Structure 1
Amino acid sequence: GGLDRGLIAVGMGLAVGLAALGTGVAQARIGAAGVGAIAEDRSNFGTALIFLLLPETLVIFGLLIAFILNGRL
């Protein structure tokens, strides 16, 4: 077998998990505040969506790094 592919996969999983945890940590508070403002004023949804577009970047990076490591394994 190989002691490199499994290590690469485990490292990618750890990276993706930590990235998702950080993304959720930001998203909880930010989206809660944005949803509160949007319920206060339906016009606020236009910027609320812009705000909610932000938490996805961490998951995107954690998926990209995982894919790169899995390929390079």
Structure 2
Amino acid sequence: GGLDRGLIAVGMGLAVGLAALGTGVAQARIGAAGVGAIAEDRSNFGTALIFLLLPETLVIFGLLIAFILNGRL
């Protein structure tokens, strides 16, 4: 084990949090535009939710990075 487990812990933590904030600003702009549209059209819900769900795959990227490294420990 040793301290290197702590170092990989902080590494995955900062990776996933930084990805989370990127996804957050993405969802900010996307949700603003989406509600502005959906207040009138109420039919573009599918494409709006698709746009919203797109960066969450990028979050899953950090998920699998954390997964493989905690498998390594």
1:58 Cα deviation after fit? 2.0
TM-score normalised according to structure 2 size: 0.87
Instruction: State the match for 2:43 in structure 1.
Output: 43
TM-score normalised according to structure 1 size: 0.87
1:40 Cα deviation after fit? 1.5
1:49 Cα deviation after fit? 1.5
Q: Deviations over 1:6-57 (max 9, x none)?
A: 1111101011011101111111101210121111111121211121121212
* Gap runs ≥5 in structure 2: none
Over aligned residues, Cα RMSD in angstroms? 1.3
Aligned length: 73
Structure 1 moving runs of 4+ over 4 Å: none
